[PDB]
């Protein structure tokens, strides 16, 4: 409604939120709850847990201070993201020694 470019297509949330998502049905049903299988809740293997209903990219914020989620939209363009990282230099090694004693 507000950006005019597209509907949220991802969400980053606390572990507790995703644990709920993975333990419930998300499709249209009468009720649904059980052992969590829908998304990965294990950040060990991946931050990206899965896709909610085939519609949203679900990720885990492993450092949530308490418990929340953020939903947002990122389009095919790069400006149409709201936020952007525009590197000029990246992961460039630095190499030498201290000539006095040759320590690296």
């Amino acid at each position: 409604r507000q950006t005019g470019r597209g509907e949220g297509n991802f969400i980053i949330a606390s572990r507790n939120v995703v644990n709920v998502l993975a333990s419930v049905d998300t499709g249209i049903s009468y009720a649904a709850q059980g052992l969590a299988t829908g998304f990965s809740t294990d950040t060990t293997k991946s931050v990206f847990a899965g896709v909610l209903g085939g519609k949203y990219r679900v990720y885990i914020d492993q450092y949530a201070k308490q418990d929340y989620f953020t939903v947002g939209y990122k389009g095919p363009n790069e400006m149409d993201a709201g936020i952007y990282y525009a590197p000029y230099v990246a992961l460039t090694p630095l190499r030498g020694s201290d000539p006095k004693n040759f320590q690296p």
Partner: peptide, 14 residues
Amino acid sequence: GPAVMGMVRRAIPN
């Protein structure tokens, strides 16, 4: 003379 990273124009609704 900064680089131009692109431009955006407001989208047209259907």
